[PDB]
Design an enzyme around this catalytic site. Structure first.
Site, PDB file in Angstrom:
ATOM      1  N   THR A   1       0.807  -1.215   0.000  1.00 44.96           N
ATOM      2  CA  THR A   1       0.000   0.000   0.000  1.00 44.96           C
ATOM      3  C   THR A   1       0.849   1.279   0.000  1.00 44.96           C
ATOM      4  O   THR A   1       2.040   1.220   0.264  1.00 44.96           O
ATOM      5  CB  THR A   1      -0.965   0.000   1.227  1.00 44.96           C
ATOM      6  OG1 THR A   1      -0.660  -1.027   2.186  1.00 44.96           O
ATOM      7  CG2 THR A   1      -2.408  -0.088   0.830  1.00 44.96           C
TER       8      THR A   1
ATOM      9  N   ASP B   1      13.317  -1.579 -12.037  1.00 45.41           N
ATOM     10  CA  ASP B   1      11.901  -1.373 -12.321  1.00 45.41           C
ATOM     11  C   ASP B   1      11.581   0.039 -12.824  1.00 45.41           C
ATOM     12  O   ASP B   1      10.897   0.797 -12.136  1.00 45.41           O
ATOM     13  CB  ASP B   1      11.061  -1.727 -11.075  1.00 45.41           C
ATOM     14  CG  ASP B   1       9.576  -1.910 -11.337  1.00 45.41           C
ATOM     15  OD1 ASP B   1       9.187  -1.990 -12.526  1.00 45.41           O
ATOM     16  OD2 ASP B   1       8.797  -1.961 -10.351  1.00 45.41           O
TER      17      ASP B   1
END
Ligand code: A1H7O
Length: 273
Positions: free
Chosen positions: A23, A138
């Site tokens: 989250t 990433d």
């Protein structure tokens, strides 16, 4: 450098977003010995992901906190880390989220200078990581964050190196053997530029992850967007070469994309312009 946030130092408010990783919460962090209230984003990372111990993670976070000096305006700064059962990352709060959402929500209003300068800034910050030998692993339009529409940053760098998956962004040597180098991030940068040139379009849309590996061997790369001129597509396809050394460096992209921004009407075709 990077604070060690006690549970009682920071507060949580709305969940800015939630993914597979965990989250991200908007909130208020007050440092150890100060009366300043700080608007922060707390990346709650999911438990039982890193085989490394919390001490092994903490010392490695301090190594990745070196990149924050001298720093670059297009690379994020980790304001502080919290280590309970989970790894909670605290940085300054970007109100305009990430670039992927931004280029989707503002697709029609987004110009050629706004687009080309985003490529510029991203290459500048990506080069800065190569200067400190930090491999991102990433790089995507969702990992590029927006501070102001005219100022973007890169986040989540070396987080895989910290704890050990986007196959469409990864280069062949990463898809097959998980070998991440600074040249691998040029392929991911190539995907990232295509993403901006497609206003948040999914790379290889629909095509299942398992296919991608063998699908790239067949020579097929991302399709050229209708706004890019042939000169821009040569740069995106240069980054998608099989050999890592055949792809360009981030220094080359900084010069090329700024040269391209010196007449964007010659490199991007859109409405309003
Ligand atoms: C389109 C919106 C979206 O996808 N994002 C992704 C995202 N991540 C974060 C964010 C929040 C807190 C902390 C971090 C990253 C910390 C980090 N990365 C690397 C490292 C050190 C080297 C090891 O630490 C990312 N946000 C975000 C950021 C700020 N305000 C709001 C949201 C977004 C938006």
């Amino acid at each position: 450098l990077l604070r060690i946030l006690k549970e009682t130092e920071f507060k949580k408010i709305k969940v800015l977003g939630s993914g597979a990783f965990g989250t991200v919460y908007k909130g208020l962090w007050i440092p150890e010995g100060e009366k300043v209230k700080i608007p922060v984003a707390i990346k709650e990372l999911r438990e039982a992901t890193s085989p490394k111990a919390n001490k092994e993670i903490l010392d490695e976070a301090y190594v990745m906190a070196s990149v924050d000096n001298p720093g670059n305006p297009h690379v994020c700064r980790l304001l502080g880390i919290c280590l309970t059962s989970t790894v909670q990352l605290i940085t300054q709060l970007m109100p305009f989220g990430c670039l992927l959402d931004y280029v989707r929500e503002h697709k029609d209003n987004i110009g050629s200078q706004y687009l080309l300068n985003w490529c510029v800034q991203i290459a500048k910050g990506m080069n800065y990581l190569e200067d400190r030998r930090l491999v991102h692993r990433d790089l995507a339009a969702r990992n590029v964050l927006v501070k102001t529409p005219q100022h973007v940053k890169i986040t989540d760098f070396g987080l895989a190196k910290l704890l050990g998956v986007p196959i469409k962004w990864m280069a062949l040597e990463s898809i097959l053997h998980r070998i991440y180098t600074h040249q691998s991030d040029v392929w991911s940068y190539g995907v990232t530029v295509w993403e901006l040139m497609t206003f948040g379009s999914k790379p290889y849309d629909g095509i299942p992850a398992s296919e991608i590996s063998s699908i790239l061997e067949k020579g097929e790369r991302l399709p050229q967007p209708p706004i890019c001129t042939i000169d821009v597509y040569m740069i995106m396809r240069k980054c998608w070469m099989i050999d890592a050394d055949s792809r360009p460096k981030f220094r080359e992209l900084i010069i090329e994309f700024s040269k391209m921004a010196r007449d964007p009407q010659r490199y991007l075709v859109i409405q309003g312009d």
